[PDB]
Amino acid sequence: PMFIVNTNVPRASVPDGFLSELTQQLAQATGKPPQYIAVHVVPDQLMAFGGSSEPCALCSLHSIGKIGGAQNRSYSKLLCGLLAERLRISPDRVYINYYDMNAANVGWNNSTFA
Amino acid sequence: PMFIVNTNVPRASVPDGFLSELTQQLAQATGKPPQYIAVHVVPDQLMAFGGSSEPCALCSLHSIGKIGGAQNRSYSKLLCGLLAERLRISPDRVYINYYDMNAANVGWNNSTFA
Amino acid sequence: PMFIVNTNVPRASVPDGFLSELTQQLAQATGKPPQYIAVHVVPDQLMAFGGSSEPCALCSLHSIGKIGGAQNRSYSKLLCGLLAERLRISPDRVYINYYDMNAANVGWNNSTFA
Numbered sequence: 193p194m195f196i197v198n199t200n201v202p203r204a205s206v207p208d209g210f211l212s213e214l215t216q217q218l219a220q221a222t223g224k225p226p227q228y229i230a231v232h233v234v235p236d237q238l239m240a241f242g243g244s245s246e247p248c249a250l251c252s253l254h255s256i257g258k259i260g261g262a263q264n265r266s267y268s269k270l271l272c273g274l275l276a277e278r279l280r281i282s283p284d285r286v287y288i289n290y291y292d293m294n295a296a297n298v299g300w301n302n303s304t305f306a
Numbered sequence: 307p308m309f310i311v312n313t314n315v316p317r318a319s320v321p322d323g324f325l326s327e328l329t330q331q332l333a334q335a336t337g338k339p340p341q342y343i344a345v346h347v348v349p350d351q352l353m354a355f356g357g358s359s360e361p362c363a364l365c366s367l368h369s370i371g372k373i374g375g376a377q378n379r380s381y382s383k384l385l386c387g388l389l390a391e392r393l394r395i396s397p398d399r400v401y402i403n404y405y406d407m408n409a410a411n412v413g414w415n416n417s418t419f420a
Numbered sequence: 421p422m423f424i425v426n427t428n429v430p431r432a433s434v435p436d437g438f439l440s441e442l443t444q445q446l447a448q449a450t451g452k453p454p455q456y457i458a459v460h461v462v463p464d465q466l467m468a469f470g471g472s473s474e475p476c477a478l479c480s481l482h483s484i485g486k487i488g489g490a491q492n493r494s495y496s497k498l499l500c501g502l503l504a505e506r507l508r509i510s511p512d513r514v515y516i517n518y519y520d521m522n523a524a525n526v527g528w529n530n531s532t533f534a
């Protein structure tokens with residue numbers, strides 16, 4: 193899986209350990225091995241959410257499966273929780289787009305997962 | 307809705323108020339209230355379009371609905387117009403990818419939409 | 421087509437000709453003229469892959485067609501090869517998401533390709 197967070201919160205506000213925590217928490221949440229989890233945090237972005245430049249985040253989670261109604265609610269609680277606690281971003285200023293990737297459309301190490 | 311523009315134009319060339327204008331104009335164009343609209347502008351990027359490093363932009367618009375043939379033509383006219391007028395990017399050096407998101411695949415405020 | 425690479429490799433380690441090399445190689449691989457190809461490289465990113473911050477890349481390739489099981493297996497070899505040689509990234513620390521875009525969902529030059 194791959195999780196990306198884009199935020200206007202400054203780099204200095206991203207705690208040491210955050211990438212590791214996202215990796216571990218996402219491994220738990222998706223049930224996929226941590227070695228397959230990629231995480232990408234992009235601070236200091238020029239962003240607005242609802243016209244306001246208060247802290248916000250635009251995120252994506254891509255996974256081959258493990259994406260769906262109840263699962264995505266669980267991920268959103270988890271991930272908004274982490275963004276609120278670690279980056280001090282209000283959950284109502286976060287969007288997370290979820291993508292259920294076909295294995296044939298995910299490349300890795302000179303092939304795909306199909 | 308979420309609009310992202312990645313461009314090689316420098317940050318200093320992005321006019322004051324650009325994210326506000328994008329918010330307002332996208333609210334009008336999509337019919338969604340501006341509170342729902344998130345905008346993300348990423349200048350100074352290392353990019354090429356057609357092998358040329360002249361000003362260009364790669365953009366995305368994600369929305370739960372309000373995506374379709376005629377609508378996307380209208381968004382393209384609007385958005386290319388703004389990138390041309392405000393960032394001085396030729397419309398023929400802009401790609402905009404449109405994504406119709408299922409509500410269940412959009413997280414917000416500790417949960418997802420439906 | 422549009423190819424994006426996000427990587428923790430530093431900017432100074434991205435060769436000046438990489439965007440052009442990618443443009444040319446992707447034109448050959450997709451069978452699309454290079455004028456249609458846009459490339460975006462984002463270095464210096466805060467990323468981890470499998471919980472490690474050794475060099476890695478998260479990439480996407482969007483195209484109106486020319487996307488599919490066999491083609492994506494081929495693109496992965498092409499792109500892993502380029503990332504390994506030019507950016508010194510191990511191919512097992514590369515993900516590439518492939519997106520077959522509907523022409524109606526790709527904006528360009530004030531309109532879409534529909």
Ligand SMILES: O=c1nc(-c2cccnc2)sc2ccccc12
Pocket residue numbers: 193194224228254255256257293298515517
């Ligand atoms: O569910 C998975 N999703 C992966 C993914 C999806 C989209 C983008 N990038 C990566 S990689 C992976 C490797 C092994 C086992 C499961 C997975």
Ligand SMILES: O=c1nc(-c2cccnc2)sc2ccccc12
Pocket residue numbers: 242284339341342343414
């Ligand atoms: O106007 C509203 N905006 C909302 C929203 C959703 C996502 C991002 N930003 C804002 S959710 C909402 C709930 C109840 C009543 C009004 C609203």
Ligand SMILES: O=c1nc(-c2cccnc2)sc2ccccc12
Pocket residue numbers: 287289307308338342368369370371372407412419
């Ligand atoms: O049209 C909407 N799209 C939203 C969206 C889509 C994709 C990514 N991020 C946000 S937020 C929203 C909230 C309530 C009612 C409509 C919408």
Ligand SMILES: O=c1nc(-c2cccnc2)sc2ccccc12
Pocket residue numbers: 401403421422452456482483484485486521526
């Ligand atoms: O295959 C193509 N894909 C293009 C694309 C797709 C997704 C995102 N950005 C660009 S642009 C294009 C122009 C003319 C003829 C073919 C194409």
